[PDB]
Every structure is written in C-alpha cells, then in structure tokens.
Subunit: 308 residues, 3 copies
C-alpha cells in the first residue's frame, strides 16, 4: 500500500498568514525523499491550486466561507481518488480547516474510518458558537453527524456530507477548549484525553485506551489529523495558536509509533505549520523537524532502530 | 464559599531583588478578573502595609526577626479574619516566610487543617541549623509542633502557636534540601514526594497517595502553599532560588486540578514570584502567567475546558 | 569503599572539537571537591598520558586503530590496578571509545559484572558494519563475546578479550540506532529500553526491569557507562552527537539514584563531554554541571536530601 503526498497550501481558515507555506517548508526538509527511504512507496501529488471566490463576504461571523468551502471541496475529491486507488493519503497543509476535505474525501471511500485528533484544540466550534469566525476552529463541526442541522447552512459547504459520528473520534492533547466547544464535546459524549488524562495515565495507557475504544469492536481505517500545536511550544513553536503544557516530542513520537504498529493508518494530516511565525529561524527548524519525524514515525521509522 | 485575595509584598525573608512587586505583578496580569469568571465570588482585601521594626538586629544568624514576624502577624490576623467569614484566603505575596502568617492564622480558625507544600525546598530549617539566616527558609520550623523547643525563641515570633504536626503535611517537589533539614524530615518522619518519588510514581499516583495520607481518616480543610520555584526554572524563571529538575507546567496544573476536585481547599499561598529577577521581559511574564494559571486551576479552571 | 578518579583525555575515537578537555572541565566544575563531601573517600589519579602511535593509518574503514587500541590498553591496566585495591573507578574521558579499556580493565577483577549503558546510541557497530569508521561507535562490539569472530581483528586491539555477554548488558536511552546495529541487538537478543520503552513504562519501571533482568538470578558488580548524549540536548548540549527526544535531567538522576541504591556500583564512565562544542560557554557549563550532578548521584547524593 503506497503513500500519496498531497500539499494544501491554504490559510483562509485563519487570520495568521504564513501557514500556506507549511507544505514548502516540510518538503524543503526532504520529507518526500526521507519517506521514500521507508518500506513504503511514495508519490507526490504536488500542491493543490486553490482559487479564491469573488464576493466572498462573511456569513454571519464566519469569514471566507465560500473560499474555504471551495478549497476543501477540491481536496475531498483529490483524497477520495487516492483513497479509492488503495494508497494512504498524507496531507501537508495550511490551517486545520482542510481536515474537512481531507476527512470527507477519506470517508467517502472508507465510511467506517475512525479519527484520532491530536490537538491543543477541539476545533469543534460551529458557525453559531464560534467567537472568532475562523474556520480552522470549526472543522469537526461540519464533519460530525450529531451537529448536522444544529447551525445554519454555510455558503460553499453545501457539498459536505456529515461523515463521522461523535463515537468515531478520539481527542488527545486538549488544553485550550472554549465554553461552546466544551459544552458540545460534553453533551455529545465524545472521547478525549486532555492533557489532564495524559498526565494522569501516561501516554502508554492513553494509546491503549484510544485503540480499545476505537478498534475494540471491529478493526477499521484510522485517520490521524495532526495539529502541530498539539505538542508543546518548545517543540512546535512556529504555529498560529501555541499553548503551554503540551505533548512532548517523545509523546508525539509514541503516538505515531503506536499508530504505525496497528497497521491501520489510512489517512494522515500534518497541519498548522507556519514558517513565518518562528521567533528565530531555529524555532521553525524545530517545528519542521518534529513534523517530519512524526510523519516518518507514522510510516515505520522507530526510535529503537530499523533494518531490512 | 467566596474567595478573599490578600496581598503580601514582603521581602525581608530574602535579599534577592524585590519580591514585593509579585502581588502587583499578578494583579496586572488580570488575576482578579479571571478568578471572578470562575464559579466563585471574589473580593480583593488589598495589600497589607507591613510596619518595619526599628533596631531589629538579627537573632544569632536569622535576619530581620522582628520585622518578619510582625508582617506575618498583620497577615495572620487578616487571614484568620477571612477564614472566620467563611471565605477561602488566597495570599499573593513575596517570600515564603509569609506562610507563617497565612498558615498560623488559617490554623487559628481551622486547627484541623492539613498542608500541601509544593516547593523545591523544605523550608524547614530551624534558627540553629540554618546556614543562611534568611527566614524564607524556616517557616515550617515555626509552624511544626515537633520543632517547638528545638531552637531559641525568635524576636517577633512569640505569638506563633505550633499549628501542625508531622503527619499533617506533605511535601511535593523536593530537590534541594540542606543536611539540617533532611535530618529533621527523616527524624520526624515527615511525608514527602521529592522529585525522585515523582519520577518513580508519576504525578498521578503522587496525588492519590497525598490525599490518602492526609485525608484517609477524616476529610479536612486543605492548605496549599505554592512556591513557584517548585516548578522547573524553564517555567518559573523569575524566582529567587531556581533549581533545575523541577515539576513541569503540566504536573503543576495536575496538582491544582486534583486539589480543586477535593472541594476541600480552604487556604492558598502563591509565593516567591519576584518580577525583578527576570533576565528578559518574557521570563517575568512567563512566571506570572504560570502563577495565575495555577491559581485559576485551584478554583475550577480545567484543561479539558469550562462552560456555565 | 574508596573512589579513584581516572582521567582519560582522549579523542581519536571520533572527529569533533576537543573531547580531550572533558576531564579538565569536570574537575573545573569541582567534581573532586563535591565528591569528597559525600560519604566516600576520594582520590584523583589524574589524567593518563597517551602515546600517539606513528604511521597510524586507517584499517579498512576504521580510523586511528593503533592509537585507540593502545590508549585503551593503558586505561585497562590503570583501571585494573585501582579495581585490584578494592576501589570504585570513575573514568572521566574524551570519546566513548575509552569504555573498551574501562570495562575490559574492570572485568579482570570482576568477571561476573554487568553493564548498564546510558546512551542515545548502541555503540555496537563492528569494523564491517560501521558507516563512519569512528571507534567511539564500536566499543561494545569489542566487549561482547557473542560478537567475537564476527569481524576482523583490529591492529592494536589484540590485548582485548570479550568480557561481557550479550545477556550481561542493558541499554537505556536509545533513539539513534544504525541498521547494522539494530540488526545486531535484535539478532543477539540484547536487552534495551529505547526512548519508546521509557515513554511507555516510565523511568521507574525501566529500572525495576533493568535490575530484575540483570540482578534477578545473581547479584554482581555493576559498571555504568554514561554517555552524556543519552540525555536530551537541552541538558547536555556540549557533546559530539546530540539527538533530540532524550532522557530528561530528572530521568538521568533517577537512573543514577537507583543504581546507587543497589549498593553494587563498581565502575563508572562519564563520557563525551566536549567543552568546545558548546554553542555558548554556558552550554558547556550546563553540560559540565549536569555530568557532575550525575556522578555525585552515583555516590549517594539524593534529591530528597543528604546529612551526615
Ligand atoms: Mn487544529
Ligand atoms: Mn490547534
Ligand atoms: Mn518556599
Ligand atoms: Mn523554594
Ligand atoms: Mn556512546
Ligand atoms: Mn552516544
């Protein structure tokens, strides 16, 4: 089962420009050539060419609706194709709003996929509860069935079909959830391991509980949507919304090594890398290298070593 | 149960910079406005005016005996006051010698309370074992009932009445304990979780054992005396006695979240925040914001999120 | 139980700056003084003078054989002599190639000894598998009985006899293993706890298993070979091959404290400190102060405290 690298240099889902540079920054590190070194065959789809929507005025408080909807509708189609072709999709992107297309496309082919969301945030605010109107903080809202109809139709998102149930997603790294989002994950019974449960249980038991919860009954495709801000600012500083007390570099790798071991990874997202937000060049180097390491970890690179 | 914020700009406990701006530093950070946003009511008692004792000559080695023990009285009378009004006292001050006043007065109203002391130090040096003479490193010595009758009375500490036994306190975070102190903690059988114990058990087990030890029998008012230098210098830089290998930001929040969950927190101290000891501008801010985060956590703010 | 410091200012085992200055830097940080403050009697044998061999050209891919072989021959005799007298040897060296002579010498007096290797690397590449030819990355290859005969004899190493069995050594901290090396530890069934195992189990369990595996059936002397790069670069930056995601300052101390508690420590190596690789003079101080603290910990210095 080969790998399909897909670049999504998009930032309209958030206010901080620079995130569209993430794909180039990651490729610059030799991500594709380093991935080919693994036991997986790699193919680089290249980046997508998202084109802005003319009079794309805010829909209520939501900004760039049509453009974010259009960019995502294209990614869904792209990821759906690659998924149908028996390959694992890996999206390097701008902001996390792209998880809409990525996950949607992935779910069209594998409607039984489960999601592991590594983030400092729940990104589950909806067009009504969001206190910012930035779409990278609402992706899970357009994807969850339980939220379907719980908010007005958004211009440009008519194509989206709620593909995942509240029971098919697990959050890890949470530590900056707004009032609305917390109410939601709580009333919907969504499984999450906030930084509190990680400190209490240790990353080892956390993954055990994540897999028993998602892959307990039967096995199914795993979609890992990784927001680099899920890790501590010490390791992934070049990002739009950094939050202290995050996942360590080590816990980040552990998560990926365990996901690798299941042999069920079907879709992967590496998001929010913003190379223009490094206080120094080295904070970017640090962020990019951590992102590359986790990506390779998802595909076999183990810290104890590897050989053929 | 409402909250009572008490200021304590006192630095006669230690020479290093000026830890009096601490109270004023935490306020500017918006500590009061954020606490009111919690499920508690909040009232600011204002910063106490400490009268400096005249020819307050050192006692053998201890410096500013009268001055220190006087500032603690006003505070101790101010604390006992709030404790009687059925309010939770939150002392925002300078050096940790002020724990003498906070705890004594708290114990005057609630003599059955227990103590959780987060610190890199034991601060249990007697006026005779101490190697510096600074009182910020002797509070537990003027508070323990087993230590009374082990050192000459000190000018200005006659009022103090040993309010805690050797089985009513639990230390968490130890990593720099002088020979004298280590003998006492061991001879008296004081319960403690040095960093060694934290590394071994993990902060999750550390709190389970703490509560089991202090509350296993009867439930009682908990007094949390938090010395910011209990957290690793990488997190709480602006402090007088930094020691590498301390508690992490996450472990610090775990402690406070678990304590809030007991519903027993009755007294609190957030000491040693010296904003004048911050190499760079962001080391003071980082220290102050961590101090504020630790306080909010104590009163309900959780990393998994909150909502009304 | 007396202690004898043995200086090994060598660097021909690798390229980089000046690891020969390692011993001078540690004594500078007052390692001898601090050692004499513990419960052990200390003595400093000073630094050994190594005779640089003439036409010492490369053997196949292996660099400076005759130089590294002879040097280790000198150290083996010296460490063998000190061990003879009933003293614990502490070797402060340059690069890790010096463990060949340190462990070889040690095994002559304690042939039943075991080894705990703290490193980010396995240092078990043979002259045929090595991709660099630097001998500081092949020490364990010379020491293991299971590997004798698996590679060609090296000029200047005929004085070496495999002393340790593939079942008498445990690795802790691994995170940068070469294909050849990984194949070897897997095929030879060597016990190791890579960063993955430490993240999984916690450092507390790692030492419990390390000891059960090593001291379970028979109690015997312990030789600790500590490569400072086993700890994360944020703590020990001044070293030749730093690798991110390492053991923390706290974990390294736990390791040493636990080893100390067994009462079986008999040999110790504090390697790879290069006070010229420090990006800044402080990065050197930080690396130096950390190695000194680990040494002191091996001899009873505990974070909970120490008294006479
Ligand atoms: Mn996100
Ligand atoms: Mn995020
Ligand atoms: Mn203190
Ligand atoms: Mn302290
Ligand atoms: Mn080594
Ligand atoms: Mn190494």
């Amino acid at each position: 089962k080969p790998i399909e690298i897909i670049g999504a240099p998009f930032s309209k889902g958030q206010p901080r420009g620079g995130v569209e540079k993430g794909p180039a920054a990651l490729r610059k590190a030799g991500l594709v050539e380093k991935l080919k070194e693994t036991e997986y065959n790699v193919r680089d789809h290249g980046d997508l060419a998202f084109v802005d929507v003319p009079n794309d005025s805010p829909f209520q408080i939501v900004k760039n609706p049509r453009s974010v909807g259009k960019a995502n509708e294209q990614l869904a189609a792209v990821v759906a194709e690659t998924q149908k072709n028996g390959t694992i999709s890996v999206v390097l992107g701008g902001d996390h709003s792209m998880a809409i297309g990525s996950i949607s496309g992935h779910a069209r082919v594998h409607p039984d996929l489960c999601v592991i969301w590594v983030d400092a945030h729940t990104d589950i605010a909806t067009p009504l509860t969001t206190s910012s109107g930035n779409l990278h903080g609402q992706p899970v809202a357009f994807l969850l069935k339980e939220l379907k109809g719980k908010f007005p139709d958004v211009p440009g998102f008519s194509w989206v079909t709620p593909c995942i149930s509240a029971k098919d997603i697990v959050y890890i790294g949470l530590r900056d959830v707004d009032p609305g989002e917390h109410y939601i994950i709580k009333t919907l019974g969504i499984k999450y391991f906030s930084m509190t449960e990680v400190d209490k249980l240790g990353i080892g038991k956390v993954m055990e509980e994540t897999f028993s919860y998602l892959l307990g009954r039967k096995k199914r495709p795993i979609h890992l949507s990784f927001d680099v801000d899920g890790l501590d600012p010490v390791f992934t500083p070049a990002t739009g919304t950094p939050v202290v007390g995050g996942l360590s570099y080590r816990e980040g790798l552990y998560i990926t090594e365990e996901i690798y071991k299941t042999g069920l990874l079907s879709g992967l997202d590496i998001m929010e890398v913003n190379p223009t937000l490094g206080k120094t060049p080295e904070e970017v180097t640090r962020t990019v290298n951590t992102a590359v390491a986790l990506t390779l970890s998802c595909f076999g690179t183990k810290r104890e070593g590897n050989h053929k």
